[PDB]
Symmetry: D2
Subunit: 198 residues, 4 copies
């Protein structure tokens, strides 16, 4: 049974970049719905797996990918943010960033473009290619999780579903993108990156 | 050259069901963007076609369907609503509903279900299957237009992208679908239906 | 644990319509590969389901849908054929066919078109819409099974993957389609149809 | 207006790796069909564009990508093979391979894997990522062209549609991939690579 992870900060901890009403709705309603529905889908899949019912297994895949991805993506998103966040990463991460994208600034333009490039619902991701030994930017639709669908390890995710910025930025997604760089918890992204080495 | 069609009513004509802030943004911002992006992409397609650049034609397909479909979908959506609508449709349309979905209420549930069932951005539609000569409900992702990607003729469309309801209903998409039944322009839906019989 | 179902007839039982080399390869190699790989995927999913690993669950969905669909689709396909097959169905099925598509002949053109319309790998299907109480034709890509992905109940399936006709018909898929109507086991399709009533 | 390009060799020039019957059918039937369907669809798109019919433009997109991509993909495929190829590439290309994939053998495994991994119809590609300035392997479904749908520049493409090998290797797709390494036209692949450095 999955559960809703608490927010490492208060709903208002990210103001003014991301107002309090968003954080509250996003975490308590949207994220909670994924967990609730994820646990239900898993129970039904467990049942179908025992009865050897492949047709039921398959029919349940959309619900599983959507709610599971939703749970995975958001669990990561909350940690990718911090009221103390902002600025540039330090050490190996910054070095890797320079090594793969050129400069921290070009990295930003690339991740911002990948995030702005999403038509419909989705996420923009900075990941790690274990196979290639280097960073990599990618975009996923709806709630498709990065690792489950691309093999890449998630380091930083930017939610560009409309519920993530509309109440404050309306249709101007570029402003939300310009604003979130101020709350990026590079401390956590560095953690995940370092984890990719071991 | 495509143009933004004026609404058949004022931004506040659908209160309290769909507020004026949503209507103004939806039309003047979202839809207007589709129009311009549609025109630009079309012109870009004209240059690629003339130069026989198939790679460019193909790279342009996502924008064409997204902005083209966006223009098609919302143009229909505005006509599907009315400050003097709601209730049950009159004439043959209602009989088709009774015949193809059992009853008006059962019809509302199915379209509401098809609408609530969109994971991510999309539209729920009541269309006409010319081949079978009867009504048929379907859901389309993002801005994919009903007829261009399915052949069914659009009769009634329900925009379930988060920008269609978030400012008013937040995450409660079912509250938005419940309210919209009050402003359905049955007259226009009947017109479209009869057209599939011209 | 799934197993490879025996063929209701010998590999040459469908000549000349579908030669023996196809039937043998199709059943013993292609179909057998699905079963082998399906059982493996299910074991891995069972493991991931216990560890609460959603990322692994999701990553395994493509393998599960492809091999499970492959196992479901082909198990049905073998029964949809018969050396004694051919002709038109009788009783309720024929009646339903006339009622939903007009005539047996128009039904054929529709199923043939849906089958010819498949770009890439896939199947053409005649199914039953439990909700609507009537027949319905649809097409599925690759090994996506009918019921698991559309809710429709499979009655007759026509495999249009290239391995199903290339050795004999090469690129002329229309000849394979024209030929298979001679081996359609209407007795089995009638069975599945009647099952949809109960 | 598009035309079927002549092969740089005779239908039997690739024996025993890819037999003459496959080469003749692949080129004279499959590819030729893409060309004509591409030209017809393009002309149909011209009429829809002129009449500003967005629904028609969109309904035509599947044929355009399928026949357009089919023409793009096979035109490249013919140039990727040679009766005087095989072995290891010479010059910078090989060094890039060593650098991006570890070694030539490791490169073959990854592309062979990406190729065997296509479920249904598709292509396995070795492309160049201009943004990152390095090699990158990717797989594309059906006839979706590499550059038009991913931005990567095609260097080497391996057709894994069943018509590319069935008449000779039957279901044993791995035997076909193993054999094709003997006719890779490294000279052409190097040319394409250097072009991403012009
Ligand atoms: Mn979100
Ligand atoms: Mn909208
Ligand atoms: Mn098959
Ligand atoms: Mn081919």
């Amino acid at each position: 049974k999955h559960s809703l992870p608490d927010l490492p900060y208060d709903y208002g901890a990210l103001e003014p970049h991301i107002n309090a009403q968003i954080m509250q709705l996003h975490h308590s309603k949207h994220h909670a719905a994924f967990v609730n529905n994820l646990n239900v889908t898993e129970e039904k899949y467990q049942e179908a797996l025992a009865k050897g019912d492949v047709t039921a297994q398959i029919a349940l895949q959309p619900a599983l990918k959507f709610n599971g991805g939703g749970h995975i993506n958001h669990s990561i998103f909350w940690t990718n943010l911090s009221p103390n966040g902002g600025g540039e990463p330090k050490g190996e991460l910054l070095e890797a960033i320079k090594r793969d994208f050129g400069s921290f600034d070009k990295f930003k333009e690339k991740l911002t473009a990948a995030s702005v490039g999403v038509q419909g619902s989705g996420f923009g991701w900075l990941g790690f290619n274990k196979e290639r030994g280097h960073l990599q930017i990618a975009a996923c639709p709806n709630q498709d999780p990065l690792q489950g669908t691309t093999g890449l390890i998630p380091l930083l995710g930017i939610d560009v579903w409309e519920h993530a910025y509309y109440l404050q930025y309306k249709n101007v997604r570029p402003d939300y993108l310009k604003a979130i760089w101020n709350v990026i918890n590079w401390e956590n992204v560095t953690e995940r990156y370092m984890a990719c080495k071991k």
